[PDB]
Amino acid sequence: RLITGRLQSLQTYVTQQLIRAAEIRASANLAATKMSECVLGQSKRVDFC
Amino acid sequence: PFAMQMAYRFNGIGVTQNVLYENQKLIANQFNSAIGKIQDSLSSTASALGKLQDVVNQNAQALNTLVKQLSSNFGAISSVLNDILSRLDPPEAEVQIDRLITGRLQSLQTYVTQQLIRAAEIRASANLAATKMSECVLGQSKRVDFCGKGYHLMSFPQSAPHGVVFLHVTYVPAQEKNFTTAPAICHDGKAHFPREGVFVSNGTHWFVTQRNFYEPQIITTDNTFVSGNCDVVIGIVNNTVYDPL
Amino acid sequence: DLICAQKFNGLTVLPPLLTDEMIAQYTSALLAGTITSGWTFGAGAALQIPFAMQMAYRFNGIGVTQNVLYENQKLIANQFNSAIGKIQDSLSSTASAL
Amino acid sequence: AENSVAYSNNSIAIPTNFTISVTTEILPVSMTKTSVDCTMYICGDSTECSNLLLQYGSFCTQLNRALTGIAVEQDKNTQEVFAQVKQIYKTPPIKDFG
């Protein structure tokens, strides 16, 4: 009973870390586009920089 | 015609179109060599399709983990379900089978949850590839580093297993030279600014040139414009602006 | 003999590969490139240009002629220097922007 | 605040001055890299517990593979934002920028 409950707590931690890591990944992809388009160039996209 | 199409793409990156027509055989030779070096890197022993193989490897590994979980007993007397039904009658066989059901539902629920998270990552990758097909293959882009490194000319798509390859053609500036420059030129107590370019000096004489390719010209009233007088501009230089008529 | 990888029931924290001193070296190279070269270092080799001439071709890119920059150069440089000091004034107050 | 624009068929408004503005934007790039020893969390140092955990299959191999993929992903997040140029430019000693 202790094994089953502790396995379920570890599985819930890992599933919510995979979902959190996917929104950090979308955020760093937006930061890499802004380093290219606002720091290494001049941008004509409205409100991007 | 294709050379007239390559000429209006040179205008899109800020080079005048006579630079393509005066260098047409050299530009076609540099293109033909660079396509031939793509093929030598893919005929090689260097496998650059690592991002496509990683998707194939992750899904086979998940299906093999799900088959190997059928050999766990999860605290029963056996992992084989016909061994339990051979040796026990349905009152106490039902205690052992419910342990195997519980462990096998939990293995399927873990498989499906991580397939949903992986499918969301493939969905964002195909959304980005649909934007590069519209903006790099169906047009010319000004977004820096979106269609290669350099100033983008054109792109070509190729088909891959479960993916797409883009071949980006860019303009990269080469062998450079130092000059002396100025912001304006003072002629009759008036300041003159270039229309599209920079004023440069070779040491004794002053010219105007375009910015990404060196092509010096005489400073006339047709490639400059007048605004204000000379006491305002920091760094103005005395010279002549020749009138062409 | 304080082995703190043993004291937390199996939970640890792994260090990042790039240190904070390496990230600060990257952001200072990106900033010395823009100030001395404009946008040329991101597309090839870095070609130097004077800084007032680089700010004149950025005025052209938003549709203002370049005499408007050279006729107003000390006004524009003073407006930039005051807006950098306002960023720093509000970060060294107890308002937390992060 | 409400507002109304003085639209007509032959009226236009043109700016006569300008303002140089400096604003700030903050983005998260990475997060903390953690690892769990799956056997020490569940069964810590006991060997009766460790042999009963073998009857559940590859649950601890599978959780450690998922957390190792998160931790490698974080160092790739930092490399795509900061390591964009491969020359380390230094800024000149005399700072005359107009």
Added chain:
Amino acid sequence: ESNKKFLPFQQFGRDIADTTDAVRDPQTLEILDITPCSFGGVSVITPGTNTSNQVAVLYQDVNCTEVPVAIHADQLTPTWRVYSTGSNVFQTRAGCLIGAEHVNNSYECDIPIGAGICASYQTSQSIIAYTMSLGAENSVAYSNNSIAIPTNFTISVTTEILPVSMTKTSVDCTMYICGDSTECSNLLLQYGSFCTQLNRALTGIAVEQDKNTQEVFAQVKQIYKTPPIKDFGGFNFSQILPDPSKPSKRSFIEDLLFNKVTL
């Protein structure tokens, strides 16, 4: 041994997780701490096993003089005990690294260790450890009246690879869980709709994969052909244009790509 300062009443201590981590002897009345002994935090650095059989070991968050204490090396085999001490002992901020020769140069990173340190199998061959290189040092010749103009150019062609779809899989729950046993399948009816749910989650993934391909490839609805005379000003497109001498519509570059992915 402990430095915990109890009260005259108490017998043992508890940490955040309510485990006993200190205790009192019921005879000599002294306080002594408890600590686990496994040390799982071991990482093994290798090149290929088709390259060498040398390895290096990293002991995580450990000072280099506590390594034979932490891993309890006196109770181990003598083939483990060579990786607890010696000449090739180097201390990083990630822990202690044993079995690699620290050099003074900097290279581009090969195997990441952590906190600025990488490792390589490099020239007899050995494993070396170094601080990594960010890039080549440079300096721009900035002046207030100097400019650089380019005089020539290069035409460059590069490559970008993107994943579009994945494999459409399907699972029959009842054959996985209760494989053709009707004693098992009647017991599975008491868990509700857990397998109608799992089947429609996989069906929505499989429909989404075909939609992923349409949005990338079916952007135009005219099938254009290229003319038979290839007069493009000297530009040669024959390796990316379809080769009609095959059963496929595939080009030469597309054929090199379909043989380098192992399905």
